[PDB]
Amino acid sequence: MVLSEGEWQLVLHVWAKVEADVAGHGQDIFIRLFKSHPETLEKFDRFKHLKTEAEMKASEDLKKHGVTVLTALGAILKKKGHHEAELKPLAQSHATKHKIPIKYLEFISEAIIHVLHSRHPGNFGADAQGAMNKALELFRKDIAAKYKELGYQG
Ligand code: HEM
């Protein structure tokens, strides 16, 4: 699949807003993910002890992790589809070291859309959400293909 320049513009326009507060968006997204799909929390040995949203918000390590994740995702989105090089190491660590099923990538994609919808309604209307979903589907599709080449079905 391929996004048009118009769709990329919608994606990058709302992403520019997210970059005004990467740490904050990172926390909201992971808290949403962990609360909505608690099973994903078990994949993080560093955070699986967190019991409440309050503890999650107060975790300095979780906040730093969120920044690392969103920074990596932002770099991929800014490539506008030409992300082969960026995807290689990400696909290897998540398939081989962390063992993250494609299903879980769908869950975090849902969390990202939910947070952008809540925080940026004016810049995240129907068309913008469709563009973001398409960009994330492309990401998940290419990651899945790499998973297979690497020997991980998940
Ligand atoms: C938007 C998709 C995602 C991106 C861009 C992303 C990115 C990253 C990055 C850059 C790191 C640090 C470097 C590395 O280990 O490769 C990381 C670590 C990790 N990711 Fe992801 N990730 C994504 C989704 C997920 C999901 C859905 C899970 C599982 C629910 C997951 C689990 C992990 C784990 C367990 C680590 C190691 C954390 C640690 O122990 O420090 N990731 N991820």
Helix, strand, or coil here: 56?
Answer: helix
Distance, first Cα to last Cα, the chain:
21
Torsion of CA 59, 64, 65, 71, to 10 degrees: 150
Resolution in A: 1.9
Binding site annotation covers 65?
A: yes
Residues enclosing ligand 1, CB less than 6 A?
40, 43-44, 46, 68-69, 72-73, 90, 93-94, 98, 100, 104-105, 108
Residue 57 lies in domain: 1-154
Mutate-to-test residue for ligand 1 from 33, 46, 69, highest number of ligand atoms within 8 A of CB: 69
What is the rounded CA–CA span in Å between residue 57 and residue 117? 20
Task: Output the CA–CA distances (angstroms, integers) from residue 83 to 74, 89, 104, 125, 130, in the order listed.
Answer: 11, 11, 20, 26, 20
CB 31 within 8 A of CB 51: no
**Do residues 28 and 119 lie in contact, with contact meaning Cβ atoms separated by under 8 Å?**
yes
Cα–Cα distance, 31 to 111 (Å, whole number): 9
Beta strand segments in 23-117, E: none
Long-range contacts of 128-133 (CB under 8 A, 24+ apart): 128/10, 128/11, 128/13, 128/14, 130/7, 131/3, 131/6, 131/7, 131/8, 131/10, 131/11, 132/10, 132/11, 132/14, 133/109
Query: CA 77 to CA 71: how far, in whole Å?
Result: 10
Rg (CA), the chain: 15
Residue nearest to atom 30 of ligand 1 (CA): 40
- Residue 140 structure tokens: 């998940």
Ligand 1 atom, smallest distance to 73 CA: 5
| Number of domains, the chain | 1
Q: What experimental approach yielded this model? A: X-ray
Q: What is the CATH number of the domain that holds 72?
A: 1.10.490.10
Distance, in Å, from the CA atom of 140 to the CA atom of 101, rounded to the nearest integer, reads 11
* Phi–psi pair at 124, nearest 5 degrees: -140, 55
Ligand 1 atom closest to the CA of 71, numbered from 1: 10
Residues comprising the chain, all counted: 154
